[model samples]
Target: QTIQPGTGYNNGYFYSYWNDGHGGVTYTNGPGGQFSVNWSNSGNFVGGKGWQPGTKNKVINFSGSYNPNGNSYLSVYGWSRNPLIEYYIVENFGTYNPSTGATKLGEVTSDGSVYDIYRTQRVNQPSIIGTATFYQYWSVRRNHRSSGSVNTANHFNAWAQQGLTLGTMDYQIVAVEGYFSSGSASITVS
Candidate 1:
């Protein structure tokens, strides 16, 4: 299935992609928001569901439940402008190889929670909105949990102390990313 950019909502609240040629994704907004993605075949494609971009300082607080079938996880995915820095507050890392080029950066505490930090550099991978080379600093929770809140600003400060430079906030996205293989994944942002 070919998942376009704004399949469910035209506003800056929903984004979907199926660049790997073997999956489908859909989004729904209502009294309760829902995002779903399904992958049948796999080759090296990265596709999933996410909300629109907003200022990074807006205290992104999201709570929801997720059901990942094969390999999927909920993450706060976005980037900073100018120099183009990318980051993810991965609430859960599914069954994929979470260690691909990832070097352990120790632990960080933010928003009343601690995260196992990992850093990776993507060289020309297609971004959610555009294509660019950037560093992905993953502040992943040591334990996998479906629902939580994140202070993006606090994470920025924590990573900054580690010598990771950040530019102007570009977008704030709460998304579920599916790489390679998948089954059924859904997230309800409430």
Candidate 2:
């Protein structure tokens, strides 16, 4: 059955970003007009990016927002009526030249030159143990440069443990796509 938009009920939501001031973007319901997305059994209410395998080089921001109307106004931050929490990393490391003649960066898989994943405690926050929930996948693409010096691409997924006590605490799911000296590369998420 086709589920109608703007009709589903949500309670709280979570989001994370590099510029959104630590912990990405996470907002939950509180006694004083806070918000959160609801955890439901029905698969319809479970919102996701609907990403497929083999997709390449796309900006994946670990961020989420509430949008009951499904319009531009949905970008509002801080507590909302429909709380939809979702997080995904930005894809695509080297694709095009922002300016003109800008050298593209490639992925380096040499010794001590590999990207790694880690679960941290919000931006600028100390790393915590057993508080991070994580999930991840990778994308593979042909090397745009000669000599096949490009490395494969992939996505990382993760989440945090439940329960909150005092002070504002959050989980940060971070993925390093790797680094290169020059050339272009592409990656996807699923």
Candidate 3:
């Protein structure tokens, strides 16, 4: 079924969606943690499922056929309240790696692969708490893959070791994201 293009739950995963520019897409929630989306000319779009008021400990597993014609991301994505942080454990991408040209903070090996860590500050920007200052932490897998398991805690620990601390969990999801691009994927999460 087509949705009104916003945030809510389908099947069991919470989803947040939007369209900008001349974006177009359609999505369907399958059984359990499965879903599919097709898009064209998307300015930006993202959706996923997991803990609503996020969690720090949980192994996020995903298997999917990911094919994107432009910039896209597959990862464990979420935010925190107190410190006002948005984080991503990026597992895969379509054309460009979000880590590219990014000033990397450090690297860590988790799930038997290497990931480059990064952090950026969004000053007086709109966040879960409206316009405010916040930080975005990222763990981009060096060797991207569409399917895998993320020991969420490992990334959190690594971030802590790098002096990037997380505040209270808000909402978390394993998501498929795109930016000013076109992409499609059929994914299942656990």
**How many clashing residue pairs appear in each of the predictions shown?**
0, 31, 0
lDDT of 1 by residue, 98-190 (tens): 545799777788766688777888898766458778788878776677766677777777787777877766655677666555555555543
Reference-based lDDT, each prediction = 0.62, 0.21, 0.82
Whole-structure CA lDDT of model 3 = 0.82
For model 1, the superposed segments whose C-alpha errors exceed 4 Å read 1-3, 7-18, 24-33, 42-52, 127-131
The Cα error of candidate 1 at residue 59, in Å, is 2.7
Q: For model 2, how does the per-residue alpha-carbon lDDT over 1-190 read when each residue is reduced to its tens digit? A: 1122221122222222111122212222222212233221112121222112212223223222222211111111111011112222222223322112322222223212332222122223212233333222122222211111221123221112112111221222222111111211111111
> What's the C-alpha lDDT at position 105 in model 2?
26
Q: Which stretches in model 3 have alpha-carbon errors above 4 Å?
A: none
On lDDT, the leading prediction is 3
Q: Which candidate has the highest TM-score of all?
A: 3
Q: Over the stretch 27-137, how does candidate 3's per-residue lDDT look in tens digits?
A: 677777787778888767776666687778888888989998988888889998878898999988888877666567899999979989998887899888999998889
lDDT of 1: 0.62
lDDT, residue 78, candidate 2? 14
